[PDB]
């Protein structure tokens, strides 16, 4: 997924794949991990990387 973002830098864009709803996500995540007891997510973390994966592969 980190290789693919570099291939659109060979197309040169500063765009986070397709929608800007991927951008809202970075802002949402940083409070959601911070507010928690001291616990990090990790069974849900692999779920939205699918929704990132299908987005940046069909778009590339």
């Amino acid at each position: 997924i980190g290789k693919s973002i570099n291939f659109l830098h060979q197309v040169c864009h500063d765009q986070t794949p397709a929608s800007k709803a991927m951008a809202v996500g970075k802002s949402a995540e940083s409070p959601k991990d911070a507010a928690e007891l001291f616990t990090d997510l990790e069974n849900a973390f692999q779920t939205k990387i699918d929704a990132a994966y299908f987005d940046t592969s069909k778009y590339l």
């Binding site: 991990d33 928690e36 007891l37 001291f38 616990t39 990090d40 990790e42």
Partner: protein, 168 residues
């Protein structure tokens, strides 16, 4: 007796007190040349011995980092954990002085046991650091997770807070 009650506050607060133990290693055993005292004081000194030693183990790692920008990452998020469970080691130390100075006021078997639940909490934290002296990332993240595989949810939670913050 009661002098030793003000003395047992000081290796918890730092290291040494009234009568010096002469070592920041090994086990932090009473040295005072008093043996014509009763041998049950001696058995409470050997409990205290691994309380004060387990406290000086937490100081070594966060003071060996002596905050550096080199591995400013993940190494120092683990030290911030070590600072948050130190602060609490001092917080039961303060309700123990509030019992001392009253405006029983002397220890009993109550606090003799009370101390050991922090020992087994701080032991969970000794076991996380003996495994990995390294400051390198993803090596500490493989270190604290090998203690979350174990049985018993009681220490598992304690290592979840560290694994959540190593991960942060």
């Amino acid at each position: 007796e009661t002098s030793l009650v003000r003395d047992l506050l000081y290796v918890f607060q730092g290291i040494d007190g009234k009568f010096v133990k002469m070592c920041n290693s090994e086990n932090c055993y009473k040295v005072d040349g008093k043996v014509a005292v009763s041998k049950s004081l001696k058995d409470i000194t050997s409990k205290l011995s691994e309380l004060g030693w387990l406290h000086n183990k937490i100081k070594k790692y966060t003071d060996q980092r002596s905050l550096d920008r080199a591995f400013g990452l993940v190494g120092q998020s683990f030290c911030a954990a070590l600072h948050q469970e130190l602060k609490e080691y001092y917080r039961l130390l303060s309700v123990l002085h509030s019992q001392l100075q009253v405006e029983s006021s002397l220890t009993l078997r109550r606090l003799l046991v009370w101390t050991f639940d922090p020992k087994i909490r701080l032991k969970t934290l000794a076991a996380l650091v003996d495994h990995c002296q390294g400051r390198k990332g993803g090596e500490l993240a493989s270190a604290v997770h090998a203690y979350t595989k174990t049985g018993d949810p009681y220490m598992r939670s304690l290592v979840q807070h560290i694994l959540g913050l190593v991960a942060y």
